[PDB]
Design a protein around this ligand. Structure first.
Ligand SMILES: CC(=O)N[C@@H]1[C@@H](O[C@@H]2O[C@H](CO)[C@H](O)[C@H](O[C@]3(C(=O)O)C[C@H](O)[C@@H](NC(C)=O)[C@H]([C@H](O)[C@H](O)CO)O3)[C@H]2O)[C@@H](O)[C@@H](CO)O[C@H]1O
Length: 406
């Protein structure tokens, strides 16, 4: 609960502010990127002046040895692509006093690291391990929710996306005097890099499982759908399509049809990364039908078109087919609904698209049947419960700096 928060970083009126009430002063030095669609998201750089500093309220600088506390925030880490990234630990969030007591969040190739140390020098480390040798990653260049909880007379725990990952006793810990400041700055990184950070908070209690799941599900506006990277999905923006069941397949334009039988392919660099190609297949765009923003929200009505060199083709469910699988056809488009619309929605972070006629009657969920995309009513009564592996689940991939390919 917000009642136990002693530091709440938000962006407002072109600067960061602490809305917890303790009033810590937050200053931005150098070049700090602020995301346009969600100002609470910022990026810091490793090779040039760039940092966000929080001069903690004196009454918050924990010098105790019994005080319980927790921290949470989301971090966005670009794909590592150089050998210099392999064994190069660097801190991104620092609250260490005179190179000794305190806590800090650092990173390294395939790692997110938490360190907690006392005045004597004793410390404890928690680490989340992930990989770059994987077809599709839930971590690389995507917002990752991190949560550290500490019970002085118990354990220190690190959570990732709401789940418990590592846990160790901090009983060997005595007096812990944190730094007066909480510095967001990439320090010790031997490469030219940056990291994204959002919704950083500190609590004076040991957050429980249920309070962590709440922070995970609420912080970012839950009514707005998300793209592949975890950012807000937008109208009038090009995206590549990824089917969550057949993640190895590319969605291609055949004639006036859409195939999903071709391989996306693999992009790799020996001993650094190996992943299926994301930027392949047709580029689509989401268009509004007949407000103050371009955010695609749950239940919104919209049109989906393939963007082919300045020509847009509306995705049309061929309702002239009696079978439940109505192949998707491409029809050159501007306001003609063609007798149908698409209901945008999602189960978790999994996007769904439901083709319906004008009277609100269901035609079918976008999916595939043989080797083609189709709108099928079969999905309504055939969705696997807790798994993204459903032919009617999709992700929209925007080509961005944090993930480069051929
Ligand atoms: C083929 C068959 O006899 N089944 C008919 C149904 O076919 C399914 O139709 C839906 C769309 O309406 C999908 O195209 C489905 O494809 C998958 C799927 O579940 O998405 C592709 C999966 O990759 C595949 N999994 C594996 C491991 O191979 C599954 C799987 O074969 C089935 O779930 C097992 O039954 O299928 C099509 O299989 C559909 O046409 C209905 C209604 O007309 O009639 C069935 O007879």
């Amino acid at each position: 609960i917000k009642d136990n928060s002693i530091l709440d970083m938000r962006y407002e009126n072109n600067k960061f502010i602490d809305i917890s009430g303790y009033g810590s002063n937050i200053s931005i030095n150098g070049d700090v990127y602020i995301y346009s669609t969600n100002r609470n998201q910022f990026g810091i750089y490793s090779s040039k002046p760039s940092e966000v500093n929080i001069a903690q309220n004196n009454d918050i600088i924990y010098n105790g040895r019994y005080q319980n506390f927790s921290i949470s925030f989301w971090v966005r880490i670009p794909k590592y692509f150089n050998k210099v990234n392999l064994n190069n630990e660097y801190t991104i969030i620092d609250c260490i006093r005179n190179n000794n007591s305190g806590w800090k969040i650092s990173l390294n190739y395939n790692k997110i690291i938490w360190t907690l140390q006392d005045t004597a020098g004793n410390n404890q480390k928690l680490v989340f391990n992930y990989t770059q040798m994987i077809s599709i990653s839930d971590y690389i260049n995507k917002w990752i929710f991190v949560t550290i909880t500490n019970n002085r007379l118990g354990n220190s725990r690190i959570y990732i996306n709401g789940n418990l990952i590592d846990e160790k006793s901090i009983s060997n810990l005595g007096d812990i005097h944190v730094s007066d400041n909480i510095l967001f700055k990439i320090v010790g990184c031997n490469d030219t890099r940056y990291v994204g950070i959002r919704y950083f908070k500190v609590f004076d209690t040991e957050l429980g499982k249920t309070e962590i799941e709440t922070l995970y599900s609420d912080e970012p506006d839950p009514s707005i759908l998300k793209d592949f990277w975890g950012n807000y999905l937008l109208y009038n923006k090009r995206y590549y399509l990824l089917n969550l069941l057949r993640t190895d397949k590319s969605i291609t334009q055949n004639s006036n049809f859409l195939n999903i039988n071709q391989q996306r392919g693999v992009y790799q660099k020996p001993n650094i990364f190996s992943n299926t190609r994301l930027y392949t297949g047709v580029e689509v765009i989401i268009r509004k039908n007949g407000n103050t923003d371009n955010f695609v929200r749950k239940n919104d009505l919209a049109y989906i078109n393939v963007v082919d060199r300045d020509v847009e083709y509306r995705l049309y469910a061929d309702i002239s087919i009696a079978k439940p699988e109505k192949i998707i056809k491409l029809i050159r488009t501007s306001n003609n609904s063609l007798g149908q619309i698409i209901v945008m929605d999602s189960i978790g972070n999994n996007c769904t698209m439901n083709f319906q006629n004008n009277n609100g009657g269901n035609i079918g969920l976008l999916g595939f049947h043989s080797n083609n995309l189709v709108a099928s009513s079969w999905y309504y009564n055939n969705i696997r419960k807790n798994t993204s592996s459903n032919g009617c689940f999709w992700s929209f991939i925007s080509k961005e700096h944090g993930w480069q390919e051929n």
